[PDB]
Structure 1
Amino acid sequence: VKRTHGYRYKSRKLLSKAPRERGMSGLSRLLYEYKPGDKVVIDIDPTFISTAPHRRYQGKVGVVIGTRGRAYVIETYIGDKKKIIITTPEHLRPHLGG
């Protein structure tokens, strides 16, 4: 039977947490202020799944283009196609590697 494609269709491992990470996450990711040109890493937080980007963007590095209210507009790539991810900071981490 063909693969089904719901928005979260092969995400058991990705959305699972170890026992020591159970419960609410810390709030420091909320407090980073990103400006255009900043580099961020998409690190999905499973306790806020409805605002999380698609599983294909986990671990990708994007560039902040701007803000939309409280979300950040991030320019990234899936293979060769440019993608625009709009997401809240709880699903973002600063990329220190350049």
Structure 2
Amino acid sequence: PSSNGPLEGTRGKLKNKPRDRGTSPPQRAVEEFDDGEKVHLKIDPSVPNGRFHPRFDGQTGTVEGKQGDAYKVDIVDGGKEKTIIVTAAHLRRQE
């Protein structure tokens, strides 16, 4: 890479297809998850806040409590265990 900011090489993953453009539906930003649930991590290009480091897009972690309205999801980066602060706006229930 020529630089090392968090958004390096995120043109694709943090952009919306022309039609999914614009403010997202509120239903999924309010969704409630229970500790132990498996959730898929994916940033909503239209939703500014509650994001996590782009490197984790694609992860499937486990909800383990929350902080404020945001949730605390445990994932495993390679072989390292990590906790991710993320809002519902960027989570989906597995299965």
| Counterparts of 2:50 and 2:7, CA distance in 1 | 12
The residue correspondences of 1:1-98 to structure 2 (distance < 5 A) are: 3-96=2-95
Partners of 1:19 and 1:71 lie apart in 2 by: 28
CA separation in 2, counterparts of 1:27 and 1:55?
A: 22
Query: Structure 1 length as normaliser, TM-score?
Result: 0.88
Equivalent pairs, count: 95
Hey, which bits of structure 1, 4+ residues long, moved more than 4 A? Answer: none
Compared with structure 1, are the counterparts of its residues 30 and 49 closer, same or farther at alpha carbon in structure 2 (3 Å cutoff)? closer
Instruction: Provide closer, same or farther for how the CA distance between residues 61 and 16 of structure 1 changes in structure 2, counting only shifts above 3 A.
Output: same
Q: Tell me the secondary structure at the aligned position of residue 47 of structure 1.
A: coil
CA distance in 2, matches of 1:17, 1:67: 28
Structure 2: gaps of 5 or more residues:
none
Give the whole-Å Cα distance in 2 for the aligned partners of 1:69 and 1:55. Answer: 22
**Separation in 2, partners of 1:37, 1:73:** 11
Cα shift at 1:50: 4.3
* Counterpart-to-counterpart distance in 1, 2:41 and 2:68: 19
- Give the alignment's Cα RMSD to 1 decimal: 1.3
Structure 1 gap segments, 5+ residues each: none
Question: Higher helix share goes to which structure?
Answer: 1
Q: % of aligned pairs identical?
A: 36
How far apart, CA to CA, are the structure 2 residues paired with 1:80 and 1:56? 15
